[PDB]
Amino acid sequence: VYSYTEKKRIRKDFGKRPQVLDVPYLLSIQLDSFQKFIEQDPEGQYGLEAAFRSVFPIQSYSGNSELQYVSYRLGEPVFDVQECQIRGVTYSAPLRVKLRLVIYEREAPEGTVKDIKEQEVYMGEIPLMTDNGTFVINGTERVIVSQLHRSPGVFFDSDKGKTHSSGKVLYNARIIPYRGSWLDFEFDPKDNLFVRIDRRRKLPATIILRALNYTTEQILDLFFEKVIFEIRDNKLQMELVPERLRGETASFDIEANGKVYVEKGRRITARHIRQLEKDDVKLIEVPVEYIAGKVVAKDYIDESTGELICAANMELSLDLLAKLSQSGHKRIETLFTNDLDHGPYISETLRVDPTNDRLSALVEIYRMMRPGEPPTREAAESLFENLFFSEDRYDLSAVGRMKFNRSLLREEIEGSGILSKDDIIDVMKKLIDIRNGKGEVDDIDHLGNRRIRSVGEMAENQFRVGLVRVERAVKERLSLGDLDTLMPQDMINAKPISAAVKEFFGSSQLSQFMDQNNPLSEITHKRRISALGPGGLTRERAGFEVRDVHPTHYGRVCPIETPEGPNIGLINSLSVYAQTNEYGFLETPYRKVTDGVVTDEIHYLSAIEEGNYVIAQANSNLDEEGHFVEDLVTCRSKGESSLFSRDQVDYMDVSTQQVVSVGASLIPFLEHDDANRALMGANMQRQAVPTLRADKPLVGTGMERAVAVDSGVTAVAKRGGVVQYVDASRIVIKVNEDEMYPGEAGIDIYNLTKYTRSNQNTCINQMPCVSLGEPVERGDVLADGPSTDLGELALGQNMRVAFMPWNGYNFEDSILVSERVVQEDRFTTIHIQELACVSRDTKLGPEEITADIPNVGEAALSKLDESGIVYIGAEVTGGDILVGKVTPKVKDSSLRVPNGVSGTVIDVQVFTRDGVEKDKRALEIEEMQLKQAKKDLSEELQILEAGLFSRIRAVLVAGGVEAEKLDKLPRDRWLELGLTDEEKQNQLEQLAEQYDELKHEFEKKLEAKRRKITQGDDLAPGVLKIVKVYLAVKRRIQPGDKMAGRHGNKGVISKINPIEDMPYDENGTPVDIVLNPLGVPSRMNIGQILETHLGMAAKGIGDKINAMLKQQQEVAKLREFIQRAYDLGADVRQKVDLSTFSDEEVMRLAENLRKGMPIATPVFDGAKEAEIKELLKLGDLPTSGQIRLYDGRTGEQFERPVTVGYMYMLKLNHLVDDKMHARSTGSYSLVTQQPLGGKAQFGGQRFGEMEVWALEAYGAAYTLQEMLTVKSDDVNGRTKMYKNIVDGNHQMEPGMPESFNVLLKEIRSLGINIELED
Amino acid sequence: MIKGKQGRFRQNLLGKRVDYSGRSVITVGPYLRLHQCGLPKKMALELFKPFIYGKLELRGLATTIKAAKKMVEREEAVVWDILDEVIREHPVLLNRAPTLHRLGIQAFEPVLIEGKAIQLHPLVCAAYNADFDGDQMAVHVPLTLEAQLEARALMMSTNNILSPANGEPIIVPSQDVVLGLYYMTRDCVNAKGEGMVLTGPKEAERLYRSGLASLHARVKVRITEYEKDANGELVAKTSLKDTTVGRAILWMIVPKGLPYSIVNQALGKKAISKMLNTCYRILGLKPTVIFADQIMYTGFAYAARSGASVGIDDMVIPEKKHEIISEAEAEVAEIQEQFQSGLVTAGERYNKVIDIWAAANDRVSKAMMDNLQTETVINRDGQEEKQVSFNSIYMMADSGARGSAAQIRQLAGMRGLMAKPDGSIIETPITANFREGLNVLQYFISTHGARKGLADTALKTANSGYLTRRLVDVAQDLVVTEDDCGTHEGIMMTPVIEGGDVKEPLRDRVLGRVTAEDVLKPGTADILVPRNTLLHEQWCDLLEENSVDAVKVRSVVSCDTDFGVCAHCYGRDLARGHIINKGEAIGVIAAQSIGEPGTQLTMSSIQVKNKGSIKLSNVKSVVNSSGKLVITSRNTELKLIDEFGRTKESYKVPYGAVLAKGDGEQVAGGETVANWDPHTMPVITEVSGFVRFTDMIDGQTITRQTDELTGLSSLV
């Protein structure tokens, strides 16, 4: 089954893998982020309540006065979308926060608060998200992208190779809180551990460990194990555990009970260890020398003296052994230190310590934070405590705490926010183990180590910053907390949070002015991810590796979508099926696989989760069951792929399309083309521009539908039914009664978006695409937007194409186009220019807007109005005045069209600073918009009343139905008609209060919008009124313009040329476009050829259909041919029939197809070559597809017949007139007498220093001198050059450019005798 | 005021902006000539406002300047005549943003063209390395007549045809016209116009355009050449030559001086490059310019005639690819099982696996190349014959228009083995090929590789720019100031052999350089050339046929110029024929030339092949016990004195190497004399006698370690 609308134009498809799951909602991530952000969800949990309870409760210290928070709410925004755009303000709604303030008595903490109060106080205003996930900050549309940042937690890195040029691999650890100070631990080539905070000066690690109030003996106990020697009357017999023997050499005869177990010098084999274990030999006799090398652990004291027999962490010898022996301490404890197993890093780390008392370590910390201040005991103590053990300046989020526990092999996922001593202890334990081999570094580029945020996250963080600021203010004012004479609006301040949020949205590396020129552009930009921004690695210093893609991005980040040149691999886009894990990571779908059945269900997996498992490859052969017919099948387990058994995977890729992102999912025949040009094209798809007409891209991919429906450029049908009124202005839908709700039934009105400004100065507009009284389905197109075609994305246009060298006109990529292509203007594009003028008040009077201007031709004034403003619809040109502005003195400063650009005025918007009058045209426009708004309100009220009264009539079909009485009286009183005692009468009564509400709401909305239009909208200070004007320019095509297809096939256009010079086939049809064959081999893509043959075949089918339509070939033959066309070969997904089709639909669909047969093709599950050959056989076209062509100029066949077909070219947004720019004599810069630059200001080309070197390379001397001197200064040189050139002379007096004199006399001012010489 | 970026030196002596300057995207307009360029009419209008005003007041159309400004901005009728008049003779500079080498700025004559894009001559784009992707080139205009003289005389394309880095013509045709010319000088065995005779090329073109004959077919045609063997005198001879129809048609475009053998080949990119080289080296400059212009035009026209296309069927996948891949899969499975059996290690397993995969890929490459090159098998007018193939892809590759063997290998066959981001080659190659579909994984890995390449290219671009900056700023000072230092001292130049084939010959290294000492041929007591003379191509070829191996030549480092360099020390100024001229600085061009390819850069025993006598250098040897010759000198090197007498082969001999022969003896070509054991340092003895333990203390200095294999131990 298929929708009526979808049945309008069924797109042919090729594909074998069934669509187990559809394309999800593409714009999901932004909606998820914001809806999670804004909601009255209980228990916080990543919501505004979370921030509130983080900042609340609040009270001045021991003030017995607590401000507590009740609830938060958001009323409707002051405006809606369209009027907000027109006005230019933020699209935002307030934040009404119920706060409860309660104050106790003295010595009554637990006692009842003596006074209570609560109020819905005002706290700032927040912007709202658009239905398309966007925002409006000031009459402008922007997108907040998410940044792929590092996951908070703990990580470990090697830093090998070039480090110290010693070949000694280092090992570093970094604990990175979600919010708090950084922390890093670093070894050195001397095998000494160290620590630094915030990349500050290096310090020993253990210094902070003893600063954690742990004794040296305690520290060594934590980081070592005890080895015991007993004074058994001589020789200090040792307790031996076999596990402390591996990888060692016995310097003595290890023996016991009179039996030798290891001879002196014999290394301890595993056999010796087993001998000891089976014999169970623990106590042995060791020589004194073996104990000399050992290091004492603790501090011993003699009984008589009590003095230090030996300091902790000290090597032993016979003298110390005797000194402790006289005391008689039978217990001699050392620590098991091995070069291989337990390097004694802690020992010398302690020996390097400056001091021993925790106070000195705290003093060192305090000095290190802010060097050059006195060390204070209590300030240092509080500093250390709150630096890592206080929410104020340190915390770990759930994600941070979760991954911290996870890395530490722990069992609990949720824990404290601040650190604990054991946390650092165990992190150091892991570090030393990695130093010893167990464990490993964490590959940072791996996504599970990374993390992605979403708009709510940063927005809530800014809210928290503002919250703490206002909390500081509140505590300050509450330090003077008086006795209930104030309410909590003296406590509060509106500026802070609103300022923070609006500033962040305005200026930020994450809030970017959206790229709004094409549905694909905006959807891709929203589905974008970056590594930049706060906590984001800088563009210039970014590592080459992070640029490089890591294997785990499979399915999670499209390798093929990222802009090239200034940066690469930092702004990788979002994969299609990728969703966001609950913990800010990237969940990806998969198909569960049982013992032998590929479970079609979906199961989501995380990054690290994939590594543990092994997953079946996408293009896997299965037979009616999911049963992998091949016992050997390629699958990937841990960053690598190889052939595995039939039953070893429990998961299976969801679809071929998963591998790429939306920006790449639309490239047909990607599998046959190199990644380089693929990426280049995929970027180029972003910058495409719509033409006047859509062209239903022939070689579709099936993704056009999903992007179309999700991209809200079109008028989607919220519900099914029929359209009752169709117009360019709007559409009226009577929803089906079952679809229609019983109460509030009414009918829907869809408002089309008209011709209006883009974000690239292009045009954007919606047009209806459905006839009157036409069935319509829910969730479906009603009116296409730009570059959308019956709800399918039509970016560029498909044209007849050929590959051959044509008189060298296509040398590098210089595309060739016939005058036919421009003749029907199918490439033509529209652009909008919004020129603005302001009326500020200066000294010596304000800036007037009068028509009267001194010394201006009446012709310039002729196109203007009485006030001095142009009439809409004027075919203005570069130079003419638009609004007559004069600076009192009086002098002329009237706005004009930019030089060299024509156009036609489409509209003038006028806003006035509140408190100044309006001219005749401004008042007229105000009245016109008033009339338009009143008209809109009246017509919507009238049609809604008509629907309501028709519902009344339907109700009165029964219940005292009256025919002559009903139509006799007018619609004023239809309830007076008879009806028995039924709910219908009450239902009719309900409709009567609905009518009264319609009246009163209409009145109130009328008054409100009347005031809103009439009132002067707030403007920046100084301005009295601002006037914008919109100029339309219809730019068609010219040589130098840039266009390309869907294979990265970049190409500028050489020369529009006659139809008659072009080659043409035997039947005479010429080729619209000709491209260079040599792009194929070097630029390693061939899919253009395949799709070209495909489009040729599809167009041949369409031509046959059109021929049999022109001839009366009634649906029977057409039905048979279409049936033949749609089945067409191997296993497919269409599986459609024509027996079900409604001959009306047959002819309508044939008409839709008379211009071509749209073909769908997944990324890799597309058609095969023979299938293309199969379609060609269905067509009349040659199986090879290389057709003989005939030259227009010579008039005969070209030997070696030529590949020709159909290609979907796209018009890029680089029009030659835009890039065109020059200058001869304009304005000089203020700071220096040099030409300006750029196009917006009439500048000149920039001569670089490498161009200087090249000039120096040539012997040309005068050229360089004059170019840098008179073409960029000397008064005599430039004046005399003007005289020569106007006189006809071409000659220069080089002289000397006075800047040399400036430098010379500047030096002379200094005590420097510098001078010329003979 | 003096320091910092705002300091006057760094403020206003640096890359500035320039008035009377323009910019736009560029196009071809091939019908134009290399001595001339296109320019959109509007740009001409705004650029030359003062010039047009001067001509206007000269004609008195509007005396005051303001009225003239009004007339021109109105775009009145007479102004275009004035524009043509001023553009009658007024060249201008065309430039590109990444100005790496000096041809990136160049002088040309504008022609007024409609539209909105600049037509640029095809070939010079290659010098500009500026594809037509949308590159926006800029334009400047000289003002003083001296600057016009400089541009027309120095920055003129006619005066800029050869590279400064070296003498190859930078005007070599790039990709398309080369296809047409390759299409010319290639034979089909049997077609129209095969098997007759013609009196000249004119009727050859007549018959071709008639369609009565094929574009190419072996046919005897009378042709005439004009040779300058005499003392600058033409001698016109004529004779029949077998040739292809297209080849004879091409012969007309050749100037008089050149012979026909040069055109009688397949005309590859290198072949045509040396064609231009000969044309310039024999006939000077203007004939080269005209010849190149006509080459452009005719090749474009006949490439259009060609209908050179490309299609899916035009690529062929040999069936043996299936079989070869099957064999490779079986072999890798066998080796993996062997590893499972424990015979081999994982590292060795992987190494052998990649080796066999590479060998299978080489087999596939050979199979497809054979399938491609000679696929044309057809009747000869008889039964059957196989000739070079006329498939478009092989024509493209063999012509050298674009690509190489590797890319066509990727197109038809497997695209080899990809590495990982760590750079280690991956065990599993790309079994599939582009013509067939590529699985998810192969495309994924290829994307890893390609993105690595792209990021590396960006980094390499930045680093090359910075390094070039360094090279220019270090060498800004040096300039030629004297003709001759009068020094007798110079470097010695010889061919270069790394230990294999000679990599750069003597002709290239010595060309255009003034000898420091005269050349002494081995007709000893022969002053083959004077002592202080320049060596150009004729002299270099004289030396080459004379078999001169080492030549002492002047060098700049040996120059005794005070505060400068002597011209004779520098020799030829490449990009020009004559010796370097006085005053012309060379440090900047040298640095710029060496830096230009900075973008193009990247970020046991011996079997003697040649036959010759044996010579040794740093020789100190002895006959071993077995009678073979071993070397007692670490720095020894073996030369194979060829039959003529020159050292065609040189190899570094390690210590104590095994030699089946000795010095001053003859070795057959392909005889193993160079062999040795690279591991372990020998203690070979100079003399013979009893080996006493002189100063050997056992147990304190040395230790007695016993071998567990044989029993005969050795002191350690």
Ligand SMILES: [Zn+2]
């Ligand atoms: Zn010298």
